């Protein structure tokens, strides 16, 4: 009824929030990869010099 | 009543969580910019050498 509708709106929104957190975690992981790549390259430079 | 108060506490908290996710996305975007900037600069170095 309307109480069921209220619960279902809330749970649907919880799933949305969870999905956003999950996609953001993939983004965070992509930034960590990119940082490690750059750190490795800066070292190779630093050692050449 | 108290059921309404319970729902309103929960929805208010959902809005907070959403707002945190939104600000964190801006932070993620700032880190992606910073990584791209550094990648471009490391390349210019790498090509000089």
């Amino acid at each position: 009824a309307d109480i069921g509708s209220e619960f279902s709106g809330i749970v649907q929104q919880q799933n949305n929030l969870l999905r956003a957190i999950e996609a953001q975690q993939h983004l965070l992981q992509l930034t960590v990869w990119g940082i490690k790549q750059l750190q490795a390259r800066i070292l190779a430079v630093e050692r050449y010099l | 009543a108290d059921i309404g108060s319970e729902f309103s506490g929960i929805v208010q908290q959902q809005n907070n969580l959403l707002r945190a996710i939104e600000a964190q996305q801006h932070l993620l975007q700032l880190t992606v910019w910073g990584i791209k900037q550094l990648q471009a600069r490391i390349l210019a170095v790498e090509r000089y050498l």
Partner: peptide, 30 residues
């Protein structure tokens, strides 16, 4: 070719950002 792979990286970033914007768009209508 890290170039092809940094291009991969960028496309992955772009895809996840597009998905997050989509989810945020659906979360405002709730």
């Amino acid at each position: 070719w890290n170039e092809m792979t940094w291009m991969e990286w960028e496309r992955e970033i772009e895809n996840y950002t597009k998905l997050i914007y989509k989810i945020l768009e659906e979360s405002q209508e709730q």
